[PDB]
From Swiss-Prot, chains A, B, C:
Pfam families: TPP_enzyme_C, TPP_enzyme_M, TPP_enzyme_N. GO terms for cellular component: cytosol. Residues 389-471 are annotated as: Thiamine pyrophosphate binding. Substrate binds at residues 26, 113, 472. Its EC number is 4.1.1.1. Mg(2+) binds at residues 439, 466, 468. It is an enzyme of class 4 (lyase). This is Pyruvate decarboxylase. Keywords: Decarboxylase, Lyase, Magnesium, Metal-binding, Thiamine pyrophosphate. Binds 1 Mg(2+) per subunit. Its cofactor is Mg(2+); thiamine diphosphate. GO terms for molecular function: magnesium ion binding; pyruvate decarboxylase activity; thiamine pyrophosphate binding. It catalyses: a 2-oxocarboxylate + H(+) = an aldehyde + CO2.
């Protein structure tokens, strides 16, 4: 029959996992044994628990959900940083922690890995702050209900959840799981509300010809990407993406006008958004970074706010309306409103201005790196872009339909990108997976490249070595922005360990000119047996113009004086 | 248009409230003003906040949902006792607290009604422990989403929720509410799971002829009372109710065999449950009181566990199956299984043995009170039965179909019954409303009878004066079970205040014999202008036989020694 | 030897309790039995748990500390309102709750009085928000350390604490308590900091001749009342009390100039505080009520802030300086600074203007009640003054040295005064105990008068019946300020229950003229066998001039618009 552990394994298989991530500890060893009994998924090991959490996060971007398994306290508390990140980025990651023997509660027992006191609910109480559901399982009979509850909640809310399992019950018998379909069961839109929300939208734009569509970073969480295309094509209006929504709308679409990001928007976009009579915002997140330090906030008078599960339009709030349904129904009813797109074209603002191919022997510059990476983009490519100037370089790239960009702009934990690229590549081995990561970020989580070597994943890593924290320099400079340099290219042979207990086929190369970069890229594409790290050397101040402007607005918002209370 | 306050009022009207309960305080006065603008419900005032909360709880039993409005800290903290009670009893009560001016956060300001520190999230953090959803509203723009969220959650989960509203935003503009239908929008059962759960049940009872049905205290929360009757009639098996499920199944139904409550069950019931091959438990709560101190736990081998949103049967767990749907579908497919009912009849155990009419002039005894109250039961009657021997007296009463009994057996807060009877009578004025309450319990919340006088509610109160805490005496006796006696009958004229600033038509009578009780009852029935309290005098040890047996098992469970860890 | 329960009892006796307050419930019965074994204190029973908590609070005002014992969940949650109150008012009240059998943790058991789930740490987690220490005791071996910890913390911090005790361990053996002296052991002031704080104060006032002293509501918590007199006599400056500090400084002292409370100060006080060169504030609490809606905040430039355990003076913060030590040392070193007192006298502002004796047959008015109550004040009297216009009537009374006034102005829970007067009278039976309480407040907690009857306590209660909530009327008026009137005088015979199971010697009288009031007062003073309630009839708008002015400022502060963020 089933055990607590194999019940969990079966539910994970049912939601579509082909892998879960783990770091062993004595409170979870028996649990890991049970998970291993299900041959329909592989157990993937990580260097540390923060990286384990972020690997699961990256996997969820590839597959829709993920799971990480850690040990009590010492494992879970660092993983909480990654789980908070999954909550911020709307990804259903299931964190499972091993926990004390169930005899140790209310017993006056002090246990290892804990605070030295005799109670053990602190971890659960902490977890409640950063999850959509959090349950502790102390007896086998209680496991099925708690497992089903957190998994259903994760998938529905698109948020992470927490489970802890007493170490001595992992192999104990419990009931068997029913059909997978039950886990995805969700409300349909309220019919009356859906129709009313659509009708009020039509009323709102009846005499507003210049309609612009703003695509936001929760569109994928709403499962509404395809519906957004149907709507945009029916409307015939202008479509822009917010920075964190890069690749959530097809850029080869004739309605697409580029990035909307205040004073760092694509040419003509800022002016078009300003002149629009109505802005239909699809699942947006307006925060201090996306509004460019609160300088770019949509006019409440013009706004149709279509969130994942509700629409606010014409002064009325309609809960219980799913965005996918709203967009589909609206596309069927809406008439052509080309005003904003016509206006955009009338500006003749031209395309984003990009650098021409550099002299191959000249010292490498930022724009030349960005140019060569952009030339690698295919419909089958995903770029993982780290917090730092890499945000801005990726934002400038023209994507062929199908190409994806992954951003972590709400949480913004430097170092996320390395483990996330690992997890994503495990989940999407068929894709050309490219990681753009700065030297500062790389140092936080660098060891996860060794797992890429281990699993023979052909991730191409562009390590941008400008000797320090350039994004921070552009916000507020000080001695804390300087770091210790490493020989990053040489790190690959360290992780290979050829001649040691095992081996690896990773490659590390240096690029100090455009010619060297082109040669390194040829080698990277040909290396199908492991990751390739290309260490690119550029100057601290050689960064995007966009970063400079944005950083000034961010610094100003952060430092504004207290107001009179 | 709408304000934060009138938005809340409209949503409350949309879920079916015709009243809300309140106690004024400076942090909620403007909010109360806004609530008053909606003429489709009345604002009802209470003596104190604990009573306010329990009045809302009683109203929710009559109407399906309720709301109470209190002031910050001094109001909310006592109301939390009642909200905990609503959570325990599965009632959607919305607690709304006024809160500090929104300028006072992060300002280093110490405010009245608070702890003397300068932060004000402690009340919200406390509330999270005893609600299904809890939101603080600090700005008007955030109100609609938070209000909709908590209300939808309350109705779906059948649990209470918490809202706090900054005092200076109550009258500020916000969006208007959409259609009421959105608030009730819920998942349908998963089709595959529903069919599978029904099929597995049929398989389970295929070769188990003696099938008994056990009706539990969450059947009403599941909305499954009518479906339970359809299923029982199709099955033809024996049906028993758990103590707290009294009146959740029609007692004039021919399959009904009475109360199942371990050694204090109706005649023949204990033996029938024991002999059953299969027990279908419909939304049960098995706790230390309902299992008679853990002496009466259903055999896991025979159990079909049909919870409100899941079924566990034949070793398989099926989430996402609504009980109402399961019972309806099962009724259509199930064949006759009369084994347990035939067995019950074969016992010839007879009816519950009840006392004959007493000599009218003899000193009043417990059984004679119970006899005369039982004779008042009609299809249009509701009995509110307080924690104490009243639990056991009510349990012994034969209910005509339509008659209701209200119990608070999970929370079990003495004094609940007085404010709950008030709230219920406000919600169901058309019914004959009877309160059975002990002298000990009455002292905790007695002042709410004055509100019954004020609103001219013809509640009939049987105050059982046995001079102390008899239920506790029967668990573990000591000096703490003795109380100060009052002239309870005389309290009515005090609450009337005739000759004072206002007036009242309440009546208070004493009964020391069966004849005096009968006369008092005649007066009570004829008093349509206010409550009638009948003070019944009986001895401390003159209590049900059931209470004595049950109390011993409870004491034993509570005191059992720690086990080796 | 000792048990968990008798250890607790002994520690309570050691801190000076002669009584503790309790409400029985099955989770605490065995604990109550153990407490009863210690014959050096009496166990006092209450009607309900909110009242139980407030009785302990009142007792702590009389004796310095107190304890209340309640049952799990249903008892504790309401008591939390009173405990929050003790925290706000700086009183060491120990709340002890019974709790589940220690076998029921991590067992998947649902228990009565709880939420219906299988974990039981929610109550402890809630309690942490409103206490200085909170411990759960699950095993006997852990009890002594946890009991000693919370008691030491309560006494040191002058704040309430929380203990819960598993019901099945109350009678189990544990270690014996050491000497009582250990419980009071506290830090001495840091010598260098004490001397430096005194020297900096002398430097600060060296060239500031007009020095005023402002006595604050934490002076008693600091144990610094006697030291304040020594300092004031040495300084020779003007001394005013904040509203909540009434009676914390002797009013027959020649340096005392009356109440400082913004625009509702005594004559000449506001102007004297404004003209002072330096204000030495002794343990103040500046909140929205004490600053009269933020209209009366001390000038930071002139302020010497002497808190209970730190001094801020001349721009320097000195932690680890006890107020009593600071004042004593300062009194030895300080020279005469009579400037502010001379200035006050030069104003010739005269005494507070009070009404002359009324015509005995004329309709009773507020000022005439206040006049007759004031005439009852002796060096042996304590007045308990409820939130409402009673705050303002008490504030106007001239106190003979030794007379006390008790206020609850930080928490401000209406109804506090009835149970607090009960607890105080239990703790200080030797005093003339007077309760001034409004009709609105009296309704929240009226049943505790029955305990005064039971224990034969000669409390004199002036019940001011102006038919509704006058203090709220003066803040913001609406229908929520109207209440149901009772025959309050008649309530006394109800609580006596003469002719019933027991008896009582309480008396209830009505007063509608000054002559009737004088006669009722004669009777009250002669009634030594029970409480006397005098129901005084006056008009809604017949209130102090001070209340009217203050209420307008309070309303304005509460309603001020949000500021731009
Ligand atoms: C876990 C965590 N700690 C600190 C930060 C602050 N932070 N944000 N960006 C940075 C610097 C990133 O530097 P690099 O990766 O070298 O990228 P560049 O800005 O292109 O040089 C920091 C230190 C952060 N975002 N996350
Ligand atoms: C708020 C709260 N505090 C204490 C308890 C414990 N308790 N349970 N039943 C009782 C006594 C009930 O007394 P009565 O209402 O006079 O009922 P009888 O048993 O018929 O005498 C108590 C004190 C409780 N159940 N709820
Ligand atoms: C537990 C609690 N609930 C509500 C409040 C708000 N409040 N403050 N004062 C009052 C009215 C006081 O009425 P009374 O005692 O009749 O006093 P008067 O102002 O003399 O009429 C209220 C309703 C409060 N202070 N405490
Ligand atoms: F471990
Ligand atoms: F208030
Ligand atoms: F209890
Ligand atoms: Mg860098
Ligand atoms: Mg009784
Ligand atoms: Mg009043």
């Amino acid at each position: 029959s089933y055990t607590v552990g194999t019940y969990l394994a079966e539910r994970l298989v049912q939601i579509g996992l082909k892998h879960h991530f783990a770091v062993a500890g004595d409170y979870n060893l028996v649990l890991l044994d049970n998970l291993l009994l299900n041959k329909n998924m592989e157990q993937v090991y990580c260097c540390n628990e923060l990286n384990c959490g972020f690997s699961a996060e990256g996997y969820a971007r590839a597959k829709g959900a993920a799971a990480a398994v850690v040990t009590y306290s010492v494992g879970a508390l660092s993983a909480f940083d990654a789980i908070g990140g999954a909550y911020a980025e709307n990804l259903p990651v299931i964190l499972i922690s091993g926990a004390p023997n169930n005899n140790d509660h209310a017993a006056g027992h002090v246990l290892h890995h804990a605070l030295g006191k005799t109670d053990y609910h602190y971890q659960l109480e902490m977890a409640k702050n950063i999850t959509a559901a959090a349950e502790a399982i102390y007896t086998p009979e209680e496991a099925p209900a708690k497992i089903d509850h957190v998994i259903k909640t994760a998938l529905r809310e698109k948020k992470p959840v927490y489970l802890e399992i007493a170490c001595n019950i992992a192999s104990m018998p419990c009931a068997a799981p029913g059909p997978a379909s039950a886990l995805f069961n969700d409300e349909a839109s309220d019919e009356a509300s859906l129709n009313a929300a659509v009708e009020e939208t039509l009323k709102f734009i009846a005499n507003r010809d210049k309609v612009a569509v703003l695509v936001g970073s929760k569109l994928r969480a709403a499962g509404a990407e395809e519906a957004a295309v149907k709507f945009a094509d029916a409307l015939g209006g202008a479509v822009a993406t917010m920075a964190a929504a890069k690749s959530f709308f097809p850029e080869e679409n004739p309605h697409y006008i580029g990035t909307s990001w205040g004073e760092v928007s694509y040419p003509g976009v800022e002016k078009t958004m300003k002149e629009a009579d109505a802005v239909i915002a699809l699942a947006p997140v307006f925060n201090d970074y996306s509004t460019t330090g609160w300088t770019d906030i949509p006019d409440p008078k013009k706004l149709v706010l279509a969130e994942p599960r509700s629409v606010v339009v014409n002064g009325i709030r309609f809960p219980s309306v799913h965005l996918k349904d709203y967009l589909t129904r609206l596309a069927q009813k809406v008439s052509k409103k080309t005003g904003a797109l016509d206006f955009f074209k009338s500006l003749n603002a031209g395309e984003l201005k990009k650098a021409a191919p550099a002299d191959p022997s000249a010292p490498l510059v930022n724009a030349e790196i960005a140019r060569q990476v952009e030339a690698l983009l295919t419909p089958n490519t995903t770029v993982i872009a780290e917090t730092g100037d890499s945000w801005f370089n990726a934002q400038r790239m023209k994507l062929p339909n199908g190409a994806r960009v992954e951003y972590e702009m709400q949480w913004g934990h430097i170092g996320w990108s390395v483990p996330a690229a690992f997890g994503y590549a495990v989940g999407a081995p068929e894709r050309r997976n490219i990681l753009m990561v700065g030297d500062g970020s790389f140092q936080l989580t660098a060891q996860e490249v060794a797992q890429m070597v281990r699993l023979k994943l052909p991730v191409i890593i562009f390590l941008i070595n400008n000797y320090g924290y350039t994004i921070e320099v552009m916000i507020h400079d000080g001695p804390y922005n300087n770091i210790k340099n490493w020989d990053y290219a040489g790190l690959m042979e360290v992780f290979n360990g050829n001649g040691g207990y095992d081996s690896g086929a990773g490659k590390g190369l240096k690029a100090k000119t455009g010619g060297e970069l082109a040669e390194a890229i040829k080698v990277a594409l040909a290396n199908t047996d492991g990751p390739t790290l290309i260490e690119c050397f550029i100057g601290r101040e050689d960064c995007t113009e966009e970063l400079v402007k944005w950083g000034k607005r961010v610094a100003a918002a952060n430092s504004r004086k207290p107001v009179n209370k």
